[PDB]
Amino acid sequence: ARVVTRDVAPSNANRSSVKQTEWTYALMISQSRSLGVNCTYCHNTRQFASWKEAPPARVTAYHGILMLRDVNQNYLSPLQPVYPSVRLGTQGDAPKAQCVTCHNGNYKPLYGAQMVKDYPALWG
């Protein structure tokens, strides 16, 4: 999803369009609304590409992407043939998860409630 150039001068290393930047903007607006936060929660908007100027939450957010890519690829999607047709989509595919599935508009799920510490069967 990166669009910003790591140089002062243009080159062929980055040829991102303004349209791709708009796509990233839409995805990040969705992420912000899924956590009930604004852009400055994970960004210093004076330079969106910087990780050192951004709060640590950004690092966490990136891992939340990777986890989702695993969950949606290896657990939820392969469950396509199990669901009845009323559960699938208009293309007949299994439902998938996003950030708001756990977060439901909060910076932490259930405001950071701890529940699995008292249920060892769910630990990994």
Partner: protein, 69 residues
Amino acid sequence: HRIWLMFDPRRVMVAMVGFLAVLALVIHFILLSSQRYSWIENGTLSAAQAPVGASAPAAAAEMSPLPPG
């Protein structure tokens, strides 16, 4: 009765009607925006089933409505 020689009754009546109407609208809308007196939705409930604001509450553990500073 000599108060009316001090202020024009036309102006006083205009200000009175305007202020009283604005106050009535504001009170009705404050009540309608509340939880206990949202009468259009929950007006059929009895006085015992109507919502009541929470009393002196207790604390919580490892749970914050606000993100850390």
